[PDB]
Amino acid sequence: STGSATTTPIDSLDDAYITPVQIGTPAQTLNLDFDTGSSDLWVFSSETTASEVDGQTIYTPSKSTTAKLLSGATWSISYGDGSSSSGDVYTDTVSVGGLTVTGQAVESAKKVSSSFTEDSTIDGLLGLAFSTLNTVSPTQQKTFFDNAKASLDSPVFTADLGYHAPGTYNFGFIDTTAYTGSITYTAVSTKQGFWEWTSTGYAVGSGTFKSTSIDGIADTGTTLLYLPATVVSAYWAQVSGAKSSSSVGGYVFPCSATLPSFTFGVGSARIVIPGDYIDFGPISTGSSSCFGGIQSSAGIGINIFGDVALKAAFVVFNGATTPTLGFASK
C-alpha cells in the first residue's frame, strides 16, 4: 500500500504545516502537525477541557463506531518549545492520504497548554519519530508509520515541504518526479529516538564550504534551524545590523536586509537554503526588526534541522531494518 497527502502551511511564515487525517468511522477529519521529532498521535477531543479549546476541530470517540477505549492508558508529553498536553487513549482507524491503519492509538487530550489553545489551525500532532519515544503508559504505543510499515510497498515516508506553499507527505514510495538530481543517503542513530544524523558541514552565501561534523535531528515539527553558536554567528555576521537579542530570544536583523543563503552538507552533497527561507518577519506587528530563521542550539542540547532546512529538500525517512535519511535538492 501507499498514501499521499498534501501538507499546508498554517500561516504566511510557514510556522508549521498541517495535513488532513481521517480518524474513526464515519471519518472525522482533523488537521494534524506531522512531527518527525516526536512519537505521539494526539488530538483535541470531546474530552478536552472546554476553556482550552478555541476553534480547533475535535475528535469525538463516542461518534466513532470503531473507537475503543484503551483501558488504563494515559499519556503526557512536553515539547522543546515548552508546550505540553495529556489525556487518555483510544484505538481507532486512522487514514492518511488513502493509507489506512486499524487499531492505531489515538491519544485524546484532556488538557493542552496555552500555545496549543491559541493556535486554532492545529488539531493535534502525528508523531513520526521512533516509537521508543511514545509516552503512553503503562503500555507504550506504536506510531502511525510503525503500524503501517509492514503493509507499505517500501518501508519509507517522504517529506516535501513547501516554501510559502503546500507540499506533500508520501508513505510507502519515493516520487522520483519530486526532486532533481540524486538522493544522498546518510546514516541515522536511533539511540535518542530521533532521526539523528551528521551533516558534513556548511557554507554561508557564496562563501567556502566548511567541512565539520554537525550532529542533529531531522524534525518537521520544529519551525527553525538550530545549529551551534559558532555556525550561527558566522551566518549572521554576513547580515549588516544583525544581532542576538536576549530580550527577543534570538538573532534579529533589519527587515530591509537581503539575506544570504545557507548551505548544509549531506555526505558529499549540498542542500542550499535560499536567504528568503530564513526570514521570519517582524518581531512584533509593524516592527522593522525581523526574526531570523537560523538560531543557536546552545542550551537546547541538540542541533535541530527543522522546517527551514527540510523545506529546501526532498527528504526520505527510510524505516528499513537499519534506518537511514535521504536528501535531494528539488
Side-chain angles (χ1 to χ4, degrees), residues 271-318:
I271 300 295
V272 181
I273 306 170
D276 292 344
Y277 289 26
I278 298 161
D279 177 14
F280 280 75
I283 60 171
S284 290
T285 303
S287 180
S288 71
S289 180
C290 273
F291 198 67
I294 296 177
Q295 296 294 344
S296 178
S297 64
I300 292 177
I302 198 156
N303 300 305
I304 306 173
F305 293 87
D307 298 334
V308 162
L310 303 181
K311 76 179 80 171
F314 177 86
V315 188
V316 182
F317 294 80
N318 171 27

Side-chain angles (χ1 to χ4, degrees), residues 215-219 222 224-227 297 300 302-306 309:
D215 179 291
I217 66 168
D219 185 0
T222 291
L224 307 185
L225 173 53
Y226 294 88
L227 293 172
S297 64
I300 292 177
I302 198 156
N303 300 305
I304 306 173
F305 293 87

Side-chain angles (χ1 to χ4, degrees), residues 171-187:
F171 292 84
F173 71 106
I174 288 162
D175 177 358
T176 61
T177 73
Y179 58 87
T180 63
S182 54
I183 305 177
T184 297
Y185 290 86
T186 197

Side-chain angles (χ1 to χ4, degrees), residues 12 29 60 62 90 117 125 176 186 227 240 248 265 285 289 292 295 302:
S12 66
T29 299
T60 304
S62 67
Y90 293 81
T117 301
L125 265 67
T176 61
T186 197
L227 293 172
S240 299
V248 173
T285 303
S289 180
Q295 296 294 344
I302 198 156

